[PDB]
């Protein structure tokens, strides 16, 4: 008699929970896409940094040769100014 009523109540409680499950799943799926894109961003910035450091190294290699050539040319100028 009264058991027909409670079965309908629990059906409506199940629909409500089913709706909540979907809201949390979708929220989670959206956050998962943001994270993957943000993780991709980290990898790309790392590789940008790797390039910038390779550039610093290339500059310092060139700076090394210029410092040597300047030192020798200064030495030769001092030798000439004596004689």
């Amino acid at each position: 008699p009264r058991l027909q009523r409670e079965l309908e109540r629990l059906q409506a409680a199940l629909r409500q929970t089913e709706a909540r499950e979907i809201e949390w799943r979708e929220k989670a799926q959206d956050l998962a896409l943001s994270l993957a894109q943000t993780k991709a961003s980290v990898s790309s910035l790392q590789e940008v940094a790797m390039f910038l450091q390779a550039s610093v190294l290339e500059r310092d290699s060139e700076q090394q040769r210029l410092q040597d050539e300047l030192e020798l040319t200064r030495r030769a100028l001092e030798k000439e100014r004596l004689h």
Binding site: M50, Q53, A54, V56, L57, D60, S61, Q63, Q64
Partner: peptide, 12 residues
């Protein structure tokens, strides 16, 4: 899979 390079004595 990529060795790292830096020049010593250049504050790198």
């Amino acid at each position: 899979n990529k060795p790292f390079k830096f020049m010593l004595g250049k504050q790198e």
